[PDB]
């Protein structure tokens with residue numbers, strides 16, 4: 001099949017290097033803690049309770065291990081609450097392996113003023129590149145802990161000029177270090193555009209995962225993205241009807257079709273769940289409860305896989321999505 | 332004249348209560364430290380150097396005291412680097428009095444995802460109100476240090492629905508506690524709209540300062556805002572040509588006209604300067620140097636006031652803008 005080609009570093013988790021064979025069943029896109037841009041300004045009434053967070057994240061970590069999952073890829077952007085040391089605490093406490101990211105969110109849902117300003121005054125792309133390269137090769141914030149992936153995100157109607165600064169920096173770091181790239185796509189769009197842009201900039205398709213692809217329910221769109229040889233992730237499995245997000249019945253309809261067409265080696269599954277919110281905990285209106293009911297990280301192990309198997313998906317295909325694909329993409 | 336009417340608290344500075352008579356010459360809108368939304372995500376290559384910041388801010392504080400200025404109003408939004416404890420260090424080290432704010436930035440230049448989400452799920456306005464009320468009456472982040480003003484900000488083409496949540500919360504806190512409100516207007520617009528909205532919600536005009544009014548060079552716009560009985564601030568004096576910002580020659584043209592028409596009691600002056608940037612220090616292209624050359628907090632004392640006086644402005648009018656107005660607005 002398609003193996004990563006070029007410069008390569010051993011997978012870096014918040015607790016250090018891990019061999020590809022030691023990754024095991026992996027959730028490729030989750031958030032241990034997360035706060036939307038602006039949460040830190042609500043510090044007075046929404047402070048971070050370290051003790052409660054640690055206890056709650058370590059428990060979720062344990063529940064995961066209980067189900068055979070050994071690794072989690074935390075895709076939290078630098079300004080959305082990323083905290084490598086905390087991730088390290090959870091990991092040293094449970095034995096759950098956690099990789100964290102380096103990257104900023106999409107123009108629409110991130111704090112883009114900082115770099116939009118630096119770009120108007122100077123060379124923001126090379127500044128973003130230096131940040132990503134330092135974080136992947138040396139470490140984040142002096143902690144000595146390195147990012148195991150680069151997180152990229154684009155808007156719905158287009159990969160904006162602000163967003164492309166990050167896409168060009170990452171491609172450079174990716175060619176230089178071979179580090180994986182995972183992405184966020186907004187509202188089921190830009191998947192083909194993201195894969196085309198990244199590969200044309202020289203990023204290795206075997207090290208790219210276009211995310212939130214479950215956000216589109218027309219398989220023509222998934223197939224068009226897959227032609228680029230990149231992997232795609234149905235990664236918000238469990239979040240249903242929440243903000244135009246589809247239902248799981250819709251995601252499985254598309255997923256089985258793709259699996260039916262031989263695409264298992266490029267298909268990955270995650271929930272994009274938040275284990276502990278930063279800021280004031282989410283006030284979820286009764287009427288929106290069914291949309292977040294299955295949005296936690298045990299949902300794929302307990303409800304999705306058994307569902308794919310009973311529908312004819314093979315143990316081998318399930319293993320390809322959950323163990324094989326992650327080992328090669330991140331290992 | 333127009334005195335504040337209603338509930339009132341003694342002015343709160345980062346080092347505690349200060350009598351109106353103890354405020355003295357005041358710069359009503361400055362930023363000791365400041366980082367545009369997103370700066371914290373650039374923590375690896377742009378960490379905060381505490382020692383360098385403290386030394387540099389205490390020096391600027393001293394330069395200010397040297398010129399007779401006793402107080403500074405720090406208008407930094409909660410998510411733009413606000414740090415009351417640090418402000419307290421500068422103040423305890425120099426004797427410079429500093430008031431800090433409670434508030435979020437305008438939709439365009441702040442991290443609005445957090446509250447836009449909380450608003451779609453619940454009652455964001457009452458959540459913002461609880462934050463402001465706690466910060467003004469009890470303290471910020473458990474430090475025991477209270478905000479001395481509420482900072483509000485609107486966009487250029489309209490005060491957006493997201494922005495109005497903050498405007499309605501503040502008006503409520505203002506009616507309840509009598510705390511002052513200072514604002515940011517974007518690109519010379521919405522001044523009359525902000526004063527009309529605030530007063531219609533019951534906020535006391537004698538406790539409201541519409542900011543960045545120097546951003547518009549048509550005095551009809553200033554006069555239309557002034558009818559509401561609120562104060563206005565030419566508060567980015569020194570920042571010239573930088574992003575549509577006018578020149579100081581333009582600001583003085585309008586200011587002398589207004590002073591010529593008797594408006595001294597409602598006119599305030601500031602620079603909106605940043606004493607120490609958060610994130611990576613600003614890379615200012617040679618070609619933009621003249622736009623920021625006079626953008627530091629000694630510019631009004633050294634160049635503006637002497638300029639107004641030589642143009643006929645009286646010592647009394649100068650004292651009204653710099654000492655009288657602040658004593659009543661914040662005291």
Ligand SMILES: [Co+2]
Nearest residue numbers: 184185212272
């Ligand atoms: Co996302």
Ligand SMILES: [Co+2]
Nearest residue numbers: 030031075272
């Ligand atoms: Co995510």
Ligand SMILES: [Co+2]
Nearest residue numbers: 515516543603
């Ligand atoms: Co402003």
Ligand SMILES: [Co+2]
Nearest residue numbers: 361362406603
């Ligand atoms: Co300001």
